PDB file of N, CA and C and ligand atoms in Angstrom:
ATOM      1  N   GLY P   1     -25.588 -41.847  69.889  1.00 56.03           N
ATOM      2  CA  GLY P   1     -25.404 -43.250  69.450  1.00 56.03           C
ATOM      3  C   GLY P   1     -25.870 -43.464  68.026  1.00 56.03           C
ATOM      4  N   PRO P   2     -26.402 -44.654  67.710  1.00 54.74           N
ATOM      5  CA  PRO P   2     -26.860 -44.987  66.357  1.00 54.74           C
ATOM      6  C   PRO P   2     -28.057 -44.144  65.917  1.00 54.74           C
ATOM      7  N   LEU P   3     -29.227 -44.446  66.459  1.00 54.47           N
ATOM      8  CA  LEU P   3     -30.435 -43.711  66.118  1.00 54.47           C
ATOM      9  C   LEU P   3     -30.544 -42.447  66.963  1.00 54.47           C
ATOM     10  N   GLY P   4     -29.709 -41.470  66.638  1.00 57.29           N
ATOM     11  CA  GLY P   4     -29.648 -40.257  67.423  1.00 57.29           C
ATOM     12  C   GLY P   4     -28.993 -40.500  68.765  1.00 57.29           C
ATOM     13  N   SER P   5     -29.567 -39.947  69.815  1.00 57.00           N
ATOM     14  CA  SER P   5     -29.062 -40.179  71.159  1.00 57.00           C
ATOM     15  C   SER P   5     -29.867 -41.277  71.840  1.00 57.00           C
ATOM     16  N   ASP P   6     -30.951 -41.700  71.172  1.00 54.44           N
ATOM     17  CA  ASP P   6     -31.892 -42.698  71.701  1.00 54.44           C
ATOM     18  C   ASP P   6     -32.709 -42.113  72.847  1.00 54.44           C
ATOM     19  N   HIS P   7     -32.020 -41.659  73.883  1.00 56.36           N
ATOM     20  CA  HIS P   7     -32.666 -41.018  75.009  1.00 56.36           C
ATOM     21  C   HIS P   7     -32.958 -39.556  74.703  1.00 56.36           C
ATOM     22  N   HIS P   8     -33.823 -39.348  73.727  1.00 55.12           N
ATOM     23  CA  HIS P   8     -34.235 -38.019  73.316  1.00 55.12           C
ATOM     24  C   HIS P   8     -35.344 -38.143  72.289  1.00 55.12           C
ATOM     25  N   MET P   9     -36.564 -37.876  72.713  1.00 53.95           N
ATOM     26  CA  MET P   9     -37.708 -38.029  71.838  1.00 53.95           C
ATOM     27  C   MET P   9     -38.870 -37.178  72.310  1.00 53.95           C
ATOM     28  N   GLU P  10     -39.525 -36.540  71.357  1.00 55.37           N
ATOM     29  CA  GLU P  10     -40.687 -35.713  71.629  1.00 55.37           C
ATOM     30  C   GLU P  10     -41.959 -36.552  71.539  1.00 55.37           C
ATOM     31  N   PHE P  11     -41.814 -37.840  71.810  1.00 56.79           N
ATOM     32  CA  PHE P  11     -42.928 -38.769  71.756  1.00 56.79           C
ATOM     33  C   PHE P  11     -42.719 -39.904  72.750  1.00 56.79           C
ATOM     34  N   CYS P  12     -43.724 -40.759  72.880  1.00 56.79           N
ATOM     35  CA  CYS P  12     -43.690 -41.842  73.853  1.00 56.79           C
ATOM     36  C   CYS P  12     -42.679 -42.912  73.479  1.00 56.79           C
ATOM     37  N   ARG P  13     -41.854 -43.282  74.455  1.00 57.28           N
ATOM     38  CA  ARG P  13     -40.842 -44.321  74.277  1.00 57.28           C
ATOM     39  C   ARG P  13     -41.473 -45.632  73.811  1.00 57.28           C
ATOM     40  N   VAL P  14     -42.605 -45.972  74.409  1.00 59.89           N
ATOM     41  CA  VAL P  14     -43.254 -47.256  74.167  1.00 59.89           C
ATOM     42  C   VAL P  14     -44.385 -47.136  73.146  1.00 59.89           C
ATOM     43  N   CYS P  15     -45.303 -46.244  73.450  1.00 59.75           N
ATOM     44  CA  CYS P  15     -46.542 -46.058  72.715  1.00 59.75           C
ATOM     45  C   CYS P  15     -46.465 -45.004  71.618  1.00 59.75           C
ATOM     46  N   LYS P  16     -45.237 -44.771  71.143  1.00 60.45           N
ATOM     47  CA  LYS P  16     -44.960 -43.949  69.953  1.00 60.45           C
ATOM     48  C   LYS P  16     -45.980 -42.829  69.749  1.00 60.45           C
ATOM     49  N   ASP P  17     -46.001 -41.888  70.676  1.00 62.34           N
ATOM     50  CA  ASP P  17     -46.977 -40.795  70.627  1.00 62.34           C
ATOM     51  C   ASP P  17     -46.569 -39.740  69.601  1.00 62.34           C
ATOM     52  N   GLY P  18     -47.258 -38.605  69.605  1.00 61.94           N
ATOM     53  CA  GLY P  18     -46.923 -37.544  68.674  1.00 61.94           C
ATOM     54  C   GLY P  18     -47.581 -36.218  69.012  1.00 61.94           C
ATOM     55  N   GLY P  19     -48.809 -36.271  69.518  1.00 62.82           N
ATOM     56  CA  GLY P  19     -49.532 -35.055  69.843  1.00 62.82           C
ATOM     57  C   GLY P  19     -49.384 -34.651  71.297  1.00 62.82           C
ATOM     58  N   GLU P  20     -50.370 -35.012  72.115  1.00 62.98           N
ATOM     59  CA  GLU P  20     -50.342 -34.704  73.542  1.00 62.98           C
ATOM     60  C   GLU P  20     -49.262 -35.528  74.231  1.00 62.98           C
ATOM     61  N   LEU P  21     -48.375 -34.858  74.952  1.00 60.23           N
ATOM     62  CA  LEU P  21     -47.252 -35.535  75.583  1.00 60.23           C
ATOM     63  C   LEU P  21     -46.957 -34.963  76.969  1.00 60.23           C
ATOM     64  N   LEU P  22     -46.624 -35.848  77.897  1.00 59.20           N
ATOM     65  CA  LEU P  22     -46.233 -35.459  79.244  1.00 59.20           C
ATOM     66  C   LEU P  22     -44.801 -35.920  79.501  1.00 59.20           C
ATOM     67  N   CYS P  23     -43.908 -34.964  79.701  1.00 60.71           N
ATOM     68  CA  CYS P  23     -42.483 -35.255  79.788  1.00 60.71           C
ATOM     69  C   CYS P  23     -41.943 -34.988  81.188  1.00 60.71           C
ATOM     70  N   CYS P  24     -40.759 -35.521  81.482  1.00 58.69           N
ATOM     71  CA  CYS P  24     -40.145 -35.340  82.788  1.00 58.69           C
ATOM     72  C   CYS P  24     -39.597 -33.923  82.948  1.00 58.69           C
ATOM     73  N   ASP P  25     -38.939 -33.680  84.072  1.00 59.28           N
ATOM     74  CA  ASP P  25     -38.276 -32.404  84.314  1.00 59.28           C
ATOM     75  C   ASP P  25     -36.774 -32.620  84.393  1.00 59.28           C
ATOM     76  N   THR P  26     -36.336 -33.742  83.844  1.00 57.11           N
ATOM     77  CA  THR P  26     -34.947 -34.149  83.931  1.00 57.11           C
ATOM     78  C   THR P  26     -34.411 -34.565  82.565  1.00 57.11           C
ATOM     79  N   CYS P  27     -35.093 -35.513  81.942  1.00 55.24           N
ATOM     80  CA  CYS P  27     -34.658 -36.069  80.676  1.00 55.24           C
ATOM     81  C   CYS P  27     -35.606 -35.658  79.547  1.00 55.24           C
ATOM     82  N   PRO P  28     -35.168 -35.784  78.285  1.00 57.80           N
ATOM     83  CA  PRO P  28     -35.959 -35.380  77.134  1.00 57.80           C
ATOM     84  C   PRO P  28     -36.806 -36.518  76.564  1.00 57.80           C
ATOM     85  N   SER P  29     -37.657 -37.091  77.403  1.00 55.37           N
ATOM     86  CA  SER P  29     -38.568 -38.137  76.967  1.00 55.37           C
ATOM     87  C   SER P  29     -40.004 -37.751  77.291  1.00 55.37           C
ATOM     88  N   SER P  30     -40.938 -38.204  76.470  1.00 54.04           N
ATOM     89  CA  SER P  30     -42.336 -37.852  76.646  1.00 54.04           C
ATOM     90  C   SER P  30     -43.204 -39.104  76.744  1.00 54.04           C
ATOM     91  N   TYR P  31     -44.242 -39.044  77.571  1.00 52.15           N
ATOM     92  CA  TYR P  31     -45.107 -40.191  77.794  1.00 52.15           C
ATOM     93  C   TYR P  31     -46.583 -39.774  77.825  1.00 52.15           C
ATOM     94  N   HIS P  32     -47.443 -40.758  78.085  1.00 53.29           N
ATOM     95  CA  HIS P  32     -48.853 -40.531  78.379  1.00 53.29           C
ATOM     96  C   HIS P  32     -48.938 -40.201  79.868  1.00 53.29           C
ATOM     97  N   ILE P  33     -49.729 -40.988  80.584  1.00 50.95           N
ATOM     98  CA  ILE P  33     -49.731 -40.961  82.036  1.00 50.95           C
ATOM     99  C   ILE P  33     -49.653 -42.386  82.600  1.00 50.95           C
ATOM    100  N   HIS P  34     -49.432 -43.378  81.729  1.00 50.04           N
ATOM    101  CA  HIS P  34     -49.470 -44.779  82.154  1.00 50.04           C
ATOM    102  C   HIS P  34     -48.600 -45.683  81.275  1.00 50.04           C
ATOM    103  N   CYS P  35     -47.613 -45.101  80.606  1.00 49.46           N
ATOM    104  CA  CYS P  35     -46.734 -45.865  79.726  1.00 49.46           C
ATOM    105  C   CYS P  35     -45.721 -46.676  80.532  1.00 49.46           C
ATOM    106  N   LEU P  36     -45.513 -46.254  81.766  1.00 49.56           N
ATOM    107  CA  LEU P  36     -44.565 -46.903  82.653  1.00 49.56           C
ATOM    108  C   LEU P  36     -45.295 -47.823  83.621  1.00 49.56           C
ATOM    109  N   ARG P  37     -44.541 -48.602  84.393  1.00 52.77           N
ATOM    110  CA  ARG P  37     -45.132 -49.494  85.384  1.00 52.77           C
ATOM    111  C   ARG P  37     -45.918 -48.712  86.445  1.00 52.77           C
ATOM    112  N   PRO P  38     -45.320 -47.668  87.082  1.00 52.98           N
ATOM    113  CA  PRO P  38     -46.043 -46.814  88.032  1.00 52.98           C
ATOM    114  C   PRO P  38     -47.037 -45.911  87.302  1.00 52.98           C
ATOM    115  N   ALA P  39     -48.070 -46.536  86.760  1.00 56.04           N
ATOM    116  CA  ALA P  39     -49.016 -45.866  85.886  1.00 56.04           C
ATOM    117  C   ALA P  39     -50.049 -45.073  86.669  1.00 56.04           C
ATOM    118  N   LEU P  40     -50.508 -43.987  86.072  1.00 53.50           N
ATOM    119  CA  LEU P  40     -51.559 -43.171  86.652  1.00 53.50           C
ATOM    120  C   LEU P  40     -52.771 -43.178  85.735  1.00 53.50           C
ATOM    121  N   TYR P  41     -53.947 -43.017  86.311  1.00 53.80           N
ATOM    122  CA  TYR P  41     -55.157 -42.875  85.517  1.00 53.80           C
ATOM    123  C   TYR P  41     -55.626 -41.434  85.583  1.00 53.80           C
ATOM    124  N   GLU P  42     -54.964 -40.679  86.437  1.00 54.92           N
ATOM    125  CA  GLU P  42     -55.227 -39.266  86.600  1.00 54.92           C
ATOM    126  C   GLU P  42     -54.113 -38.458  85.949  1.00 54.92           C
ATOM    127  N   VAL P  43     -54.438 -37.263  85.491  1.00 54.06           N
ATOM    128  CA  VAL P  43     -53.438 -36.388  84.900  1.00 54.06           C
ATOM    129  C   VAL P  43     -52.742 -35.580  85.987  1.00 54.06           C
ATOM    130  N   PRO P  44     -51.425 -35.768  86.147  1.00 54.45           N
ATOM    131  CA  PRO P  44     -50.647 -35.068  87.167  1.00 54.45           C
ATOM    132  C   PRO P  44     -50.496 -33.588  86.833  1.00 54.45           C
ATOM    133  N   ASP P  45     -51.341 -32.771  87.444  1.00 51.24           N
ATOM    134  CA  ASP P  45     -51.390 -31.347  87.137  1.00 51.24           C
ATOM    135  C   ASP P  45     -50.188 -30.605  87.722  1.00 51.24           C
ATOM    136  N   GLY P  46     -49.534 -31.215  88.699  1.00 48.70           N
ATOM    137  CA  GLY P  46     -48.381 -30.598  89.313  1.00 48.70           C
ATOM    138  C   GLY P  46     -47.075 -31.112  88.746  1.00 48.70           C
ATOM    139  N   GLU P  47     -46.488 -32.089  89.420  1.00 48.74           N
ATOM    140  CA  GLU P  47     -45.221 -32.663  88.996  1.00 48.74           C
ATOM    141  C   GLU P  47     -45.405 -34.100  88.536  1.00 48.74           C
ATOM    142  N   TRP P  48     -44.395 -34.618  87.852  1.00 50.43           N
ATOM    143  CA  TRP P  48     -44.408 -35.989  87.360  1.00 50.43           C
ATOM    144  C   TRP P  48     -43.031 -36.352  86.819  1.00 50.43           C
ATOM    145  N   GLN P  49     -42.576 -37.559  87.112  1.00 49.45           N
ATOM    146  CA  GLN P  49     -41.299 -38.024  86.601  1.00 49.45           C
ATOM    147  C   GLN P  49     -41.372 -39.483  86.173  1.00 49.45           C
ATOM    148  N   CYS P  50     -40.388 -39.877  85.386  1.00 49.93           N
ATOM    149  CA  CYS P  50     -40.284 -41.215  84.843  1.00 49.93           C
ATOM    150  C   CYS P  50     -39.928 -42.227  85.933  1.00 49.93           C
ATOM    151  N   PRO P  51     -40.119 -43.531  85.665  1.00 45.98           N
ATOM    152  CA  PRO P  51     -39.644 -44.580  86.564  1.00 45.98           C
ATOM    153  C   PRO P  51     -38.123 -44.603  86.583  1.00 45.98           C
ATOM    154  N   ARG P  52     -37.564 -44.548  85.391  1.00 45.25           N
ATOM    155  CA  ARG P  52     -36.136 -44.410  85.184  1.00 45.25           C
ATOM    156  C   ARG P  52     -35.892 -44.064  83.725  1.00 45.25           C
ATOM    157  N   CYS P  53     -36.953 -43.566  83.077  1.00 44.51           N
ATOM    158  CA  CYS P  53     -36.960 -43.282  81.648  1.00 44.51           C
ATOM    159  C   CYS P  53     -36.433 -44.479  80.861  1.00 44.51           C
ATOM    160  N   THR P  54     -36.815 -45.666  81.307  1.00 44.12           N
ATOM    161  CA  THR P  54     -36.370 -46.904  80.689  1.00 44.12           C
ATOM    162  C   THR P  54     -37.280 -48.053  81.131  1.00 44.12           C
ATOM    163  N   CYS P  55     -36.805 -49.289  81.003  1.00 47.28           N
ATOM    164  CA  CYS P  55     -37.571 -50.461  81.418  1.00 47.28           C
ATOM    165  C   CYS P  55     -37.963 -50.351  82.894  1.00 47.28           C
ATOM    166  N   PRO P  56     -39.270 -50.312  83.183  1.00 46.08           N
ATOM    167  CA  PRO P  56     -39.771 -50.067  84.536  1.00 46.08           C
ATOM    168  C   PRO P  56     -39.749 -51.311  85.425  1.00 46.08           C
ATOM    169  N   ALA P  57     -38.622 -52.010  85.430  1.00 46.01           N
ATOM    170  CA  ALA P  57     -38.445 -53.161  86.302  1.00 46.01           C
ATOM    171  C   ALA P  57     -37.727 -52.752  87.578  1.00 46.01           C
ATOM    172  N   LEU P  58     -37.053 -51.615  87.520  1.00 48.99           N
ATOM    173  CA  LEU P  58     -36.334 -51.090  88.671  1.00 48.99           C
ATOM    174  C   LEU P  58     -37.257 -50.236  89.531  1.00 48.99           C
ATOM    175  N   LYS P  59     -36.764 -49.827  90.688  1.00 49.69           N
ATOM    176  CA  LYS P  59     -37.532 -48.977  91.583  1.00 49.69           C
ATOM    177  C   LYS P  59     -37.372 -47.517  91.193  1.00 49.69           C
ATOM    178  N   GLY P  60     -38.454 -46.916  90.723  1.00 49.69           N
ATOM    179  CA  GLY P  60     -38.427 -45.515  90.371  1.00 49.69           C
ATOM    180  C   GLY P  60     -38.756 -44.637  91.556  1.00 49.69           C
ATOM    181  N   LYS P  61     -39.619 -45.140  92.427  1.00 50.77           N
ATOM    182  CA  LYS P  61     -40.010 -44.414  93.622  1.00 50.77           C
ATOM    183  C   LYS P  61     -39.960 -45.330  94.838  1.00 50.77           C
TER     184      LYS P  61
HETATM  185 ZN1   ZN N   1     -37.248 -39.018  82.167  1.00 51.04          ZN
HETATM  186 ZN1   ZN N   2     -47.369 -43.293  76.191  1.00 49.25          ZN
END
């Protein structure tokens, strides 16, 4: 699209990260551990996925 593909970033969609990043296993987006509505305070050492890699108003889980 305009600004690249939009859905492709090595940083946080919301909190504009740059260093430490936790990304999905599906899409090319990176987050903290609480940038989305289904936020965690713990670091998911196993698996982790986005709510919908977008506005977390929908049901991700
Ligand atoms: Zn994703
Ligand atoms: Zn973040």
